[PDB]
């Protein structure tokens, strides 16, 4: 059975030619609205939230960890390094790496966060520690974005990611200073204007992280503060049948617009 919200999302999915996954958590009453909410999707750069959060967790018991400089060598650069390239033969602190990963989607910065955690399994291990039993990070940048249909590597479900994003930003999976820091980072994202944000009332505050990959995978995860009512968490994942499909950030905007109706 489906609600009119789900029917609208199914129609958007049909017209787009792809596979759409949505999870909304309304924290006023802890209801969820799901569309393919227990199906796996490739996370692409939305996984940078879990990596940054895992480093924030480490910093709860190593007070200055975020301010630790990390060397950036020429060989560390991968395919998209808008911030790290400025620091080759220099340094970036773990805070600077987290900001670059989250707010610019810098892939060298993500690889440094993964290294800090001991490899992709360190990110997964943090997920498990905060009760996310679904997330898995298998690979580093850039290969975590291959997004092959049905491949479980580097995937999660919309429901799981919404539950976790809620725990990280509105709950207490992180300590007080750390939660606030994650929210500050997410709110300042520079890559999200065409995705969830484009579908929401303009007076709302939004923290988000986008992702993009092969198979035209186009993703966004967000914490949202509507005007006058309790915050929301919204996950929108989208992927397509052909390897070289174009991005479809508008699909995510349209999913957000649908979900916002009646909110
Ligand atoms: O930034 C370097 C740091 O990233 C890791 C992954 O956490 O390795 C990635 O970057 C290397 C250098 O560009 C690649 O050769 C490697 O395949 C890639 O995973 C760490 O191993 C490395 O210390």
CATH number, domain of 204, equals 3.40.710.10
108 lines ligand 1 (CB under 6 A): yes
Q: Measured between alpha carbons, how far is 60 from 161 in angstroms, rounded to an integer?
A: 22
Query: Which residues partner with 127 through β-bridges?
Result: none
Q: Measured between alpha carbons, how far is 81 from 78 in angstroms, rounded to an integer?
A: 7
CB 111 within 8 A of CB 78: yes
Q: Phi and psi for 69 in degrees, rounded to 5?
A: -70, 140
Count the neighbouring beta carbons within 10 Å of the beta carbon of residue 4.
10
Final resolution, Å:
1.1
Q: Which residues contact 122 (CB under 8 A, 6 or more apart)?
A: 54, 114
111 Cα to the center of ligand 1, angstroms:
6
Place of tokens 């606030």: 180
Binding-site residue set? 141, 145
Closest-CA residue, ligand 1 atom 10, reads 76
CA proximity to 35, closest of 72, 7, 76: 7
Report DSSP letters for 238-253, one per residue: EE-SSTTPPP-HHHHH
DSSP letter assigned to residue 103: I
Q: Measured between alpha carbons, how far is 119 from 128 in angstroms, rounded to an integer?
A: 15
| Containing structural domain, residue 32 | 1-263
Query: Which residues partner with 23 through β-bridges?
Result: 34, 235
| Alpha-carbon dihedral 97, 98, 104, 105, rounded to 10 degrees | 100
Overall number of domains in the chain:
1
Query: Which residues partner with 34 through β-bridges?
Result: 23
Q: Phi and psi for 218 in degrees, rounded to 5?
A: -140, 115
Q: Phi and psi for 59 in degrees, rounded to 5?
A: -70, -15
76 Cα to the center of ligand 1, angstroms:
6
Atom of ligand 1 at shortest distance to CA of 75?
13
- Experimental approach: X-ray
Buried b / exposed e along 81-102 (16+ C-beta atoms within 10 A): bebbeebeeeebebbbbbbbbb
Q: Measured between alpha carbons, how far is 249 from 232 in angstroms, rounded to an integer?
A: 20
- Please identify every residue annotated as catalytic: 45
């Amino acid at each position: 059975q489906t609600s009119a919200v789900q029917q609208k999302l199914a129609a958007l999915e049909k017209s787009s030619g792809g596979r759409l996954g949505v999870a909304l958590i309304d924290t006023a009453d802890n209801t969820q609205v799901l569309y393919r909410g227990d199906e796996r999707f490739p996370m692409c750069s939305t996984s940078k939230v879990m990596a940054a959060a895992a480093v924030l967790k480490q910093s709860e018991t190593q007070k200055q960890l975020l301010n630790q400089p990390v060397e950036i060598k020429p060989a560390d650069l991968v395919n998209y390094n808008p911030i790290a390239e400025k620091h080759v033969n220099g340094t970036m602190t773990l805070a600077e790496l987290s900001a670059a990963a989250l707010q610019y989607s810098d892939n060298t910065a993500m690889n440094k966060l993964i290294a800090q955690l001991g490899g992709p399994g360190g990110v997964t291990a943090f997920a498990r520690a905060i009760g996310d039993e679904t997330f898995r990070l298998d690979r580093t940048e850039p290969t975590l974005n291959t997004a092959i249909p049905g491949d479980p590597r580097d995937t999660t479900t919309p429901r799981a990611m919404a539950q976790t994003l809620r725990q990280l930003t509105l709950g207490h999976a992180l300590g007080e200073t750390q939660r606030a820091q994650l929210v500050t980072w997410l709110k300042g994202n520079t890559t999200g204007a065409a995705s969830i944000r484009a579908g929401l009332p303009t007076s709302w505050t939004v923290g988000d992280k986008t992702g993009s990959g092969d198979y035209g995978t186009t993703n966004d995860i967000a914490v949202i503060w509507p005007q006058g009512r309790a915050p929301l968490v919204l996950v929108t994942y989208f992927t397509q049948p052909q390897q070289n499909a174009e991005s479809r950030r508008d699909v995510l905007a349209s999913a957000a617009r649908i979900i916002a109706e009646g909110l």
